[PDB]
RNA sequence: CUCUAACUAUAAAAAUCUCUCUUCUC
């Protein structure tokens, strides 16, 4: 479908008719939706993509934040334990495979389902310390809609990790399980199973 | 004049425990009594605009299956000898009832004031926390 | 294969009181398992744990002992319950104290019974137990009378 | 010292004076060394008239106001914050504070 | 501390020829297949499993989807 | 019964709290152009979220 | 050179303290 001819010969599906920009040149971030109203503009499936890693000025201003792709800011927050702070490669590598068994399991395009994940594993209402010293309390609070997002990205690699810390599975189809559980209300899911845990806590608390 | 069976609702909201107590117009017939402390596990609490909220709300739908739907209010603080000042929660209890469904009509507060008499409760020296 | 809770229904009721054994605390109190229902676990609060004020939160729970409790709302769709240990009467502890013990010792007895006849603790409670707490009350009058009258 | 020309009682020329009992802790104190302010109020907040406004019979009601003194020892009166411990040239003007709102 | 586990061998650590019945017939109603999964199945070992997930690949059974290393993911032929 | 209801915020009330963690707002709620509340919030917020309230009426007051 | 309208809502507990005191004249 429409090669051209150069000196040096790209290969067939970078080449093609590539003006279709795709995540990893795979999932396609059309048809991508977002369920609940609140958390649109809190994500960025809007802007399409080539890598899950662009480093740029994310956090110099009170909000760009938010303008971080997704699968980024997912990736970012793969990295924990200390030891493996960095090392993205290794975190974009293991979203690249979490993306493939998404695509596996449920076949709906990845990036759904990991929109998905998110929006339903973030906590509508917390807590807040506010007794003082003697009858100390637990105040029920809302809860922001971007402290939402990234509480979800929190808690679902949180899972992940603590799904394959010294566990024969695999980091990347762990957080793809997860991910799975996340979609629907599976609250064999660790995140969402937490995220259940603070909402009952903040009602019993109201 | 469409109907309204009328009720009063008594609303007597302390600085803690607040109360609901919807009665016919002669205050002779009590319907659903639940109080602050019904629906709430602190006791702390108790006076808290939730407490206020949920008894409000479980008596209003008392109030629905019963039949009454116009309210009357007799809002009272502790009042005799006590802080002459109404509860907390009260007012919330005020703002469910006219949420849920029932018409309100003719706000009163019957607060018991004294005409200085026995001696308030304390000591010279009163409360010194 | 320890299962087959105590009482009829395997989700806790409406203001009852039970015991519990303390496993694990993270932040608001303890999620942790029951032995008087079938094995689920349950929120301890922090805001209701204790008479005095909360000056620690090692003392008072003793990890892996039994301990008491009263539920609030039974989370009746998945297995979730909010539970308390501060709104316990003081001579509603001791009652509820023998009503658990009373519980216990027909699974002990009933527990030998499954592993010797290798038949899960399920059956023998379907079949045994149950008919005897709906006669006498409880399996361990039963019992009792069991051993009086044949 | 005498800290208040006033001597901080305003009795002046009267001997003695009838005491009323503080409404937060209930310490007897002299009718005028006893600071007090007119708590007056609608009996439903501003921020919930409209719920009743829209939800009511009797069209256009009164909704009236409650009216009430409160007397406070001047302990509680500093501690609640009725009234702040100024300070010394501030100390001889007894005007209330410019009408909060105008 | 205490070996408080009590876990058994809960793998495979040579095959048999039951077990190669089991896998060959195996690749079929397992529509997600990695090494975790063959060991989570509780048949294979596990240093064999990236042995016997390449020996599927003997007749196409289940075809790569991507064969990077430190996993392995697979789909039946359809 | 699951009144998930939606509010977004008009305008922000300043910053509140021991720890001084927690925002309150007034929210106009998306549905019912009329009414306003105001609520506490938990993570930075701006004019033009939408907060995900379960509960509507329990109006929050100042938190100390 | 004409005027007098708004308003909220906290308190748990915290005892004691060994020295060593030293100039201003151009
Ligand atoms: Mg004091
Ligand atoms: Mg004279
Ligand atoms: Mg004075
Ligand atoms: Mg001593
Ligand atoms: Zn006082």
Known sequence: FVPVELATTIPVEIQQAQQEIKLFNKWSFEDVEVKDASLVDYIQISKPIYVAHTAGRYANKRFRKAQCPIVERLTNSLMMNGRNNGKKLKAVRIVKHTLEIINVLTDQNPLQVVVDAIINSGPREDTTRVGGGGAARRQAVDVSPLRRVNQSIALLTIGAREAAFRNIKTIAETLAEELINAAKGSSTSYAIKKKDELERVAKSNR | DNSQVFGVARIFASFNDTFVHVTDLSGRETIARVTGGMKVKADRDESSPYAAMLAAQDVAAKCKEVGITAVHIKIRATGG???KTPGPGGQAALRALARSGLRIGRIEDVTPVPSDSTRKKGGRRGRRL | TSHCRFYENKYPEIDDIVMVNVQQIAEMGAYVKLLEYDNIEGMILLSELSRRRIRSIQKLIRVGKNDVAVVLR??????????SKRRVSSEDIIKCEEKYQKSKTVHSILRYCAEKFQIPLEELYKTI??????????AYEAFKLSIIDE | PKKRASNGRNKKGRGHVKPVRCVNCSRSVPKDKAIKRMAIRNIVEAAAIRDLSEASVYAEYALPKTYNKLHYCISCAIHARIVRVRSRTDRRIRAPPQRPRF | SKKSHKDKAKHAVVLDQDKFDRIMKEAPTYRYVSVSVLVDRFKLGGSLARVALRHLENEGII??????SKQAIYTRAT | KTPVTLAKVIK????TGSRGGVTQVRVEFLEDTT?????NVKGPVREGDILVLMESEREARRLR
């Open chain 3, 74 to 83: 039974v989370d009746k769709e998945k297995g979730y319950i909010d539970l």
């Open chain 3, 129 to 138: 137990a149950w008919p005897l707490s709906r006669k006498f009350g409880h």
């Open chain 6, 12 to 15: 922000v009330l300043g910053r």
């Open chain 5, 63 to 68: 075809k790569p989807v991507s064969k990077h």
């Open chain 2, 81 to 83: 000898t006590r802080s």
């Open chain 6, 35 to 39: 009414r306003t509340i105001v609520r």
